[PDB]
Design a protein around this ligand. Structure first.
Ligand SMILES: O=C(O)[C@@H]1CCN(c2nn(C(=O)c3c(Cl)cccc3C3CC3)c3cccc(F)c23)C[C@H]1O
Length: 241
């Protein structure tokens, strides 16, 4: 009715559509866990075979976030520079948050290539400090027992941030940010879930995790470059140089 309630449906639709899997499908598969036979298979793989697999799962992940951003109200009406600046900075932060859905805090596993498995599965990659942080972030986000609308509005907020450096129409972004802040506050009140606001991770934590992540990603792309069919080419030319 109040148009903010409309935006809540809009942002929840976008997220529902741009989701790879469904929460119940990820929840039921918690039983189907990789055997040591299969874990060893992964550990034994080349660093580069594992890098190719992981790189494509990540480019796929980013492509759904790019589609989610496209489906957000008034995102296209922004200038390409602002679309770049927002997406370059936040798309992977959204991927990191989205990841807590495929993470099981009981066995400390993640749903990868059809089954749930631990961080050891990634030994071949040789970046244990980073993988542990990723798994640690997802373990803290797991505690919030985030609902699907809660992840939707939060990730839309992660993306839409007027504080990003390099915005040419900061004011046009602030207007989008503030409606989403209302949408999220409103929704949280309606459902008696505002308690999560205090439990939400600090902005700096997320940006630090992401930067480390994108650095190891940029390092591997220099060594063993993968090829991706760009959903947003001016972003691709920016990230992949
Ligand atoms: O248009 C598309 O389909 C592209 C998908 C990959 N993508 C993005 N990749 N990306 C990466 O860290 C990444 C990934 Cl995931 C896989 C391989 C190599 C890299 C590093 C060289 C950058 C990023 C980080 C932060 C924000 C983003 F957008 C992207 C750009 C998009 O334009």
């Amino acid at each position: 009715l109040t148009e903010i309630e409309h935006l809540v449906q809009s942002v929840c639709k976008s997220y529902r559509e741009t989701c790879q899997l469904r929460l119940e499908d990820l929840l039921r598969q918690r039983s189907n866990i990789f055997s040591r036979e299969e874990v060893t298979g992964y550990q034994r793989k080349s660093m580069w075979e594992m890098w190719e697999r992981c790189a494509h799962h990540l480019t796929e992940a980013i492509q759904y976030v790019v589609e989610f951003a496209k489906r957000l109200s008034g995102f296209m009406e922004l200038c390409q520079n602002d679309q770049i600046v927002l997406l370059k900075a936040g798309a992977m932060e959204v991927v990191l948050v989205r990841m807590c859905r495929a993470y099981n805090a009981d066995n400390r596993t993640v749903f990868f290539e059809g089954k749930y498995g631990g961080m050891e599965l990634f030994r071949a990659l040789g970046c244990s400090e980073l993988i542990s942080s990723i798994f640690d972030f997802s373990h803290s986000l797991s505690a919030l027992h985030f609902s699907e609308d809660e992840i939707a509005l939060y990730t839309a907020l992660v993306l839409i941030n007027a504080h990003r450096p390099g915005l040419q129409e900061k004011r046009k972004v602030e207007q989008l940010q503030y409606n989403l802040e209302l949408a999220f506050h409103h929704h949280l009140h309606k459902t008696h879930r505002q308690s999560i606001l205090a439990k939400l991770p600090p902005k700096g934590k997320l940006r630090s995790l992401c930067s480390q992540h994108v650095e190891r990603l940029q390092i591997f792309q220099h060594l063993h470059p993968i090829v991706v069919q760009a959903a947003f080419p001016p972003l691709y030319k920016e990230l992949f140089s």
